[PDB]
Amino acid sequence: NMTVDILCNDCNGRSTVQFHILGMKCKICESYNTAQAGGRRISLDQQ
Ligand SMILES: [Zn+2]
Numbered sequence: 001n002m003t004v005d006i007l008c009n010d011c012n013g014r015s016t017v018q019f020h021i022l023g024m025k026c027k028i029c030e031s032y033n034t035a036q037a038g039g040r041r042i043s044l045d046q047q
Pocket residue numbers: 008009010011012013026027028029030031
């Protein structure tokens with residue numbers, strides 16, 4: 001019910017899985033080394 005979209009650090013592919021605190025398995029490479037791909041876009045001017 002709680003699905004979060006996560007992005008991978010090693011195979012760089014995203015998987016929409018449930019939010020699992022004990023480990024969200026990337027189905028692409030069997031790795032738990034993942035970030036969240038639901039990163040919110042904020043508008044800020046930076047030079
Ligand atoms: Zn992966």
